[PDB]
Specification:
The structure is a homotetramer. In chain A, strand 2 (16-18) and strand 3 (26-32) form a beta hairpin. The first copy, chain A, has one domain: Lipocalin (Beta Barrel). The first copy, chain A, is globular, with a radius of gyration of 15 Å. With 113 residues, the first copy, chain A, is mostly beta strands. Chain A is built from no helices and 8 strands. The interface between A and B is large, with 52 and 55 residues. Bound molecules: E-amino biotinyl caproic acid (BH7) (4 copies) and 2-acetamido-2-deoxy-beta-D-glucopyranose (NAG) (4 copies). Residues 10, 12, 14, 33, 60, 63, 65, 67, 87, 89, 106, 108 of chain C line the site of one E-amino biotinyl caproic acid. The PDB classes it as unknown function. Keywords: avidin, streptavidin, biotin. The assembly is tetrameric. The entry is titled "The avidin BCAP complex".
Chain lengths: 113, 115, 113, 115
């Protein structure tokens, strides 16, 4: 199967740790990068798949931004677990007139540390 | 003051209710979509500078599919004295093989108001 | 049908004008906002649809950014032509290490001016 | 110096050749995807400060479908002395009715190198 629980690291030099996905599929973890912000997510548990679909939020302790990730767990063709993800990074604006430029979008690949 | 606890609605006629957010900043809620189908939502509201219009984010875990939708946004105070939720979302679909990852993520927009 | 050719305006106070889609589907136009940058695009011409799918690029004359739009022409339920679009706004970075924060993503609805 | 004229390849094994860009800054090319299927591409390279690594953008008009793919990017000079094209893309699908607009746009990533 492909568990999320554990430590992961990405193509950007940003490690990550994930707790034990509970009954209803929730979990928490921590995110580390050049700080240490809290993480909260949910892995889709329906057809009890082996390559689950998931999503989590990160509220930074060093600023008023939020990043959300969606992604899937894959057992790569080379046998490794890989989290392919995509994110939305929201910035805090002042006026509803500047909303248009608050969202950034990116990719990010993780692996077991 | 822009608070997230409440019952919001949108441009697609999708309802959502969010409970009270705790000390840390998290909350849960329900997402009634479109059949009528409910789904639990879990997310956090940023609480750095206790800014009246915070930045939030949550996950929707579809009960009727094996996909996930993550939402980011800003609780804005509308000009006429109301709250509006501008959000962006990314819908992830489950694909059997890593080879089709490229076609598994959609992006869209949503905007909510007090029900 | 739903022609792109003409003047359009959006929910952001940014007008736009489009030339005569040629044989192969290409076109040019101009974009106006609070400057006046050039526009180049292509409307998908295959099944000669009445609500075509399209895409164009905008290279700003006031900075080193580019925005690309994809979208479709719809005859709304109220009978109006509406261009629903989504864009990617790329910023110029210095190092391949900062690439991650160059792309912004948004929505934008147009109507016949 | 990062020039766009050339034959690039990628992580998906999709080839692309772009011609010479004119004074204004536009170019055309071919997009060989995956059957082998070619598609004309049209785009512009930003030419403000004549910056060695410019910002570009183009459209791919699929010959085999009624969809459009727009690409943005930056011609970066890789650390070991090569050119890399980091791009983001948005794939638009044709939907019969405006009611399903929300589910018609995908977003992804691509990265190219000299073939
Ligand atoms: O706006 C500018 O020009 C730069 C501003 C200073 C840095 C801004 N950063 C923030 O607010 C939060 C840091 C987020 C790091 C991101 S999340 C998306 C991406 N994936 C990953 O593993 N790290 C990056
Ligand atoms: O893949 C196809 O071609 C269609 C598949 C059938 C429907 C797929 N839908 C799902 O798995 C979950 C429903 C999510 C509804 C989305 S979340 C993003 C958007 N915002 C909103 O308020 N509703 C929609
Ligand atoms: O980076 C900041 O904090 C702000 C920088 C100053 C303004 C940046 N703007 C640019 O480089 C180009 C202007 C693009 C306007 C955008 S294109 C996406 C959106 N749709 C539309 O009709 N107008 C806006
Ligand atoms: O809608 C479905 O469920 C699948 C439909 C059949 C395939 C749809 N494809 C198309 O209409 C055009 C092919 C585009 C290929 C894309 S462009 C974005 C990505 N980058 C790249 O190098 N190849 C892919
Ligand atoms: C964890 O991963 C490696 C080694 O542990 C290194 O990047 C650093 O120690 C950590 N990464 C981050 C982003 O802190
Ligand atoms: C939810 O919104 C209101 C409830 O206040 C109701 O009139 C409407 O029909 C409901 N819509 C959905 C999608 O559940
Ligand atoms: C064109 O649209 C209206 C009236 O023509 C107004 O916004 C302005 O004159 C123009 N718009 C822009 C963005 O220049
Ligand atoms: C294109 O790339 C090279 C041509 O130099 C060739 O070996 C490869 O098979 C081609 N791939 C596609 C998708 O056309």
């Amino acid at each position: 199967k492909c568990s999320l629980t554990g430590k992961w690291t990405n193509d950007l030099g940003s490690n990550m740790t994930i707790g034990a996905v509970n009954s209803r599929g929730e979990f928490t973890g921590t995110y580390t990068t050049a700080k240490e912000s809290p993480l909260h997510g949910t892995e889709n548990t329906i057809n009890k798949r082996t390559q689950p679909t998931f999503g989590f939020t990160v509220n930074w302790k060093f600023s008023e931004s939020t990043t959300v990730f969606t992604g899937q767990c894959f057992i790569d063709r080379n046998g490794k677990e890989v989290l392919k993800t995509m994110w939305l990074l929201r910035s805090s604006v002042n006026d509803i007139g500047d909303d248009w430029k608050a969202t950034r979008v990116g990719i990010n690949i993780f692996t077991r540390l």
